[model samples]
Target: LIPNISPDSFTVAASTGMLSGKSHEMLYDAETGRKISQLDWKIKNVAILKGDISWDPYSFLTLNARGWTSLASGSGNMDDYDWMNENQSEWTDHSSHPATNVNHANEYDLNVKGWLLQDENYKAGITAGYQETRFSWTATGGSYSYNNGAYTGNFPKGVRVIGYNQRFSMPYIGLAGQYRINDFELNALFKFSDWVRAHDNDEHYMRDLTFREKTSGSRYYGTVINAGYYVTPNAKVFAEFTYSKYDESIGGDAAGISNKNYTVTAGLQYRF
Candidate 1:
């Protein structure tokens, strides 16, 4: 839920992503290998917050703290298999688990946001914050595994099943601005983040999953574009599109996850 106060500011939001196409199979040594396809779902969470402070009518310093709870299950990427195999035996054994489609274990994120700003014909702000996350998964519905142990193919009572607990702290900073037109307003923002201290319950989840000595930090960048119009002195409508990029890594590879990725989003808003 979002609640904005008079002479103050606030924001609340939600997000998701999707993929589809013919499943591809990875082949090796002229033999049938693992099958690949995408399992689909809404992947994200809902967040809410409210806070503000100002010295001038056009210039003010604001602080916003947001917390998020997710609804989307999970979707793991292809690289996870390679990372898993190099560290875990169950993932490498053909009889254990194939390099089939992988799904992200369940996970959630919590973030805190704070910024100092000055707005006039030009607007600028410096932002700093932290984020914490948890990721987990289980093996089921397949002829695999050596026992009911962690990597085994046995199903659990679905109770408090054994799962990985991955967590981290991300600190970020950014700048944002807007230019007004006769009928609408234009907006833009750029932000950066670094991930530190990756923690997990899976001992071999990574080559050094149990040891903090191997994990290194990763970086991420995000951009946003927005436009809007006022309907009345007391109400208005708006839309926003955002793009994000990240530096990923696996198994304590200091180089981190390879490739840069992006996400797009559209939104509408109402005000009192």
Candidate 2:
């Protein structure tokens, strides 16, 4: 239980800011099982909006939820790569193009927490949660390089290139804790999942072709930390940082999916 002059029952908050990060995916030759193609989407200076709500129905029960999305301010580039052999010692084709759009989707998470130990100065809990996130990118015209082991050439930029979309969802269990030092509260949480469901959709504008791929495996992690300083007994301003990664591989197909994201969030919270 949080020591208060009587803590509030629930909270609602909203924040507007910018995001900077990247996402990537790679393909494999079906027959040879060799890495063949890959794409890197760089996202920077992207406008974002976030909201959250938390409810404490009892001394031992808590429910927390949050979601965020990017606006039209996304700016970055996408890089394409290819290799002819399995060892991948040399590249056969490569291109870097501007991203016409990034964060064309939304990401969210929900947690149900139960306190295992509680007191006035510190509290610790275990959490069960579900998380789902989606991302997409569209590439614009850019120069391309072609090399087929014996020759190299530069292709002129004259066409819209490709579009990519992906989604990942997973459930996790973690430990969370909070400590209060006078008017300042520090909080942290860590989550992990050994299984994830992954999906990818890719389009080639010039070739007029589309491909959809699905794979499943592991390598997912989420960590968060924040410090909240009370402006009043019921209101406080906080800044938080999160480092997350979602990955899936080793399925029927050899395709690989991975995304690493870093978020810096600052907002105000008021309890009623």
Candidate 3:
């Protein structure tokens, strides 16, 4: 499924596909573990591409991008709540948007990968990579209700009332393996980062106030598994499933950036 550690010559390869998935992010009271706000983003037909080059098959450099998705083509939702009691029995504020749109969604990765175990039909390797990803959305034209307060009706269709952006920077190490028999191949990848920085920012458009949060030592991880078929000597077609997540829950109102995504992609790869 990947370049051989010991090859006859140099190897250059690329893969491209469309990934569709739903991403969810939430912020909660760290002390109480009650959600303060949440956003769900639905993304479809996201263009993902990866390219790598290897001078020697033992090691290779790779770059990946997943940013060619249009924000307007998707829909999302944002909800905010306030817990008045420690037991969370009462809520002072409950706000929700019937529908919303994503403001931004993008990700990029750079990696240096190498194979440690290479055999006739099996290969195992390690990889280290850096990835930067961000997702943002706004809540507009929503309703607000409270225990003793009057209900606020919906605003205009496209009025931006609340906006949120979540970002993550990670340096990760991973294990990858591939086993091939004739024209069929199976591949797996598991990557993780213990040292991750996550930032959450939100803007109250009506109040003209923007809140920012910074959290360190976030847990980040992802996994991918795929089965490929060799349609040609140098080309392959694969079906893959990928899942990723980030969790950073510090204490005292510094809420965690709860984010995750599940995607299945049909990809094509070519090597030269």
Candidate 4:
């Protein structure tokens, strides 16, 4: 959603970043040293609201709030090997599950800058912000089993389930810049988030499967590049590309998750 923007005034606009990806060998089986499962995920829609108050031409304050939901499917094989003298029986099981997730995030920032080297066409500045994000998801899918051994039995669906919540708060600093030539404008932003807290409440149907982390060892970095062409003084069309990376430790050294996401969007902006 796009909002209204004007100079030396308070304005509100819509902001969004829609992203999705795939991961192979998503989980591991420690004892067998094999991949426990593979997962495919999609987060096709993220909605946000952005508002800013420009006190003057050189200084401003901005806030953005975002929320989104995602879906995922996981597939894996579970095997049991029995080594017996008389009767040698081995069992292999295959299962698939689907899950849903939701996330919300908000940020507030302040920035101030002026023309550098007395060139009005180029402006550079520094920005600082505080952000918080919360995520929750649930997965409940049962696997159908076809016995391939001496003992034959079928497992019903809804046998395995899991739920978890993760929360994060961070304060960040970054650089912002923009340049304009004729009717074309280009801008870029880069930021690093210092971890305040990365907490988790995870639960599962099996043992040694629940863990929590409320401490450090989490960080994030993000980048954005944007280009715009002004059709009139109050309207313009633009395209943007963004990338973000997150590295964190959850549970312990043996269990964790990492994320690298990218997004691209094209739209029009207007002022009145």
Candidate 5:
């Protein structure tokens, strides 16, 4: 969310802002007609708290936290003939093949962070927290195997499948620092995390994992930097960049993926 404080002192507040973000359901692999793990059904929750007042050079000090959840859990079916490379006795024979669904549940998170700055020269802060994630779904709906031709067909009149659900908790810590020179401000952050579990179907938890058998816990770390410059008495410009790396025990799922992103933003406004 966001915050709004008094003229020149630290103020406590209970407020909420609009919520909007990306989800995995929006992304799908056109080639395979399968959804991407990262982009599949996602959820997010964010909160901002106004901390104690800054008595000295620190003008505004506050705490902020944001959380994300995933709802990509669902069952699907696919053509076994494509995978088995076998010609079954009848088209319905392949229909017996099991369905496919990624059981990604819900995740709860709380980030306890504080912001501080002395005078008009420099500002810095740090925050850490616990994260709880879970997943669940009812029986039915999955990538199907088209036995008729391309293993594409509906269920047998009355067949529904439900999924298993599970949730895990992880503890994480992060740091943020900022410096202001004239009308320009610089910021940076470093974050570290513990190993967290990723869920899947129980029939053969790791059977669908390809090379690996099961998903073990893993570690995550990342860093970010940003800069803001005042264009006038009431307006400013900004830019940001970030990178992250993951280390997992599981051969595939937990192996983790690396990410790099950068963005530049500029805006002008007036304040009364």
Candidate 6:
């Protein structure tokens, strides 16, 4: 007699999950400056959460979320040579004070996304999804003062001097392809949206420095590539690379700024 398996056996449950970390250093030029004022940003850590489920063949639904926190320090010096050009006595005097050396800021990021995928083969698929991202930043331990005619420099005040908040939402379409050779699988995904909405606000102690911006039309694109190796029948290790870009215009004169990022990740997964 043969062993019996019923429709319940075909009603399988499959899940996909991901966990990764990242860190990097960045430089930012002040929006309203002569390029002499700059901020150095260091991302201390990033956490990502992703999960997927499938009960049918060649199909799955996935949810992804990520969070990161960063520390930024701002300075007014254009170059290291500028320090030598300053009066030696004044440089020595101010260098010894913590207020003159450190102007710290904090930045936080959060994103949530959900998508449904339909696979035609091990080779091609399509996905539709929605995603939202939130950004919050606070400049602490510093104050920019207006002197003479222009914004002079940052001074350590050990308190919050400015804040920025921005939020974005979009619905997207994606195309994906995969190939398997032996026990290794290679995959690529591309997602894009021509329409997006963004709302942003900036706050400062001086009322003149506060502003709000809103835009309903924007462009965004993202790409992901991954390679996976199976070590067991149900366990695998994978490496992934991702890049994303966003473009939007908030005002007529201000043509808007572009933002982009790159990430490399690796992790292990098991399915049942």
lDDT, candidate 3, at 127? 78
Model 3, position 236: C-alpha lDDT score: 73
TM-score of each: 0.49, 0.89, 0.79, 0.60, 0.39, 0.57
Model 4 Cα lDDT, one tens digit per residue, 1-272: 12233556432223344544321113444454344332333333444333333343333433333223232222222222222222323324333444334333333444433423325477676656665554454445534343334444433355445555555567777777888777787878787876655666656664447755454566778776778877865566677776666564233333334445555566665554
Q: Against the true structure, whose TM-score is highest?
A: 2
Model 4 pairs in collision: 1-14, 3-13, 3-14, 142-158
Model 1 poorest ten-residue lDDT run? 21-30
Task: Answer with 2 or 6, whichever has the higher TM-score.
Answer: 2
**Following a full C-alpha superposition, what root-mean-square deviation does model 1 have from the true structure?**
9.8
Instruction: Give the alpha carbon lDDT tens digit for every residue of 1-272 in model 5.
Output: 11122343332112122111211111123355342222122113222121111221233434333333332443322222222222433433233324434343333445555665445566677757665544433234434444355546565433343333334445778886877777776778787776655333322222342121233455656565656666654444555444444343123422222211122222222222
lDDT of 2: 0.77
lDDT scores in order: 0.36, 0.77, 0.67, 0.49, 0.39, 0.44
| Candidate 2 wrong stretches, greater than 4 Å | 1-8, 30-32, 148-159, 249-251
lDDT for predicted candidate 6 compared with the true structure? 0.44
Tens-place lDDT digits, model 2, residues 1-272: 23254433988776667666677778887787777888887776677777889888888888999888886647767888888656556778787786456737567989888999998788899988988888888787776766743444333454557888889888888899989977898989988888777888888887889878777666688887878888877787888777788874334666788787766778988787
Estimate, for each residue in 60-157, the C-alpha lDDT of model 1 and write its tens digit: 54444432323333332221222124234343422222222223322223332233543333455565555443333332222333222345443232
Ten residues in sequence with the least summed lDDT for candidate 2: 149-158
Ranked candidates, highest lDDT first: 2, 3, 4, 6, 5, 1
Candidate 4 overall Cα lDDT vs. reference? 0.49
Which candidate model has the greater TM-score, 4 or 6? 4
Q: Candidate 4: where are CA atoms >4 Å away? A: 1-7, 15-17, 21-118, 142-160, 205-211, 249-258
Decoy 6 TM-score against native = 0.57
Q: For candidate 3, lDDT tens digit of each residue in 150-175? A: 65666667788887787888899999
Give per-candidate clash totals.
Answer: 7, 0, 0, 4, 25, 0
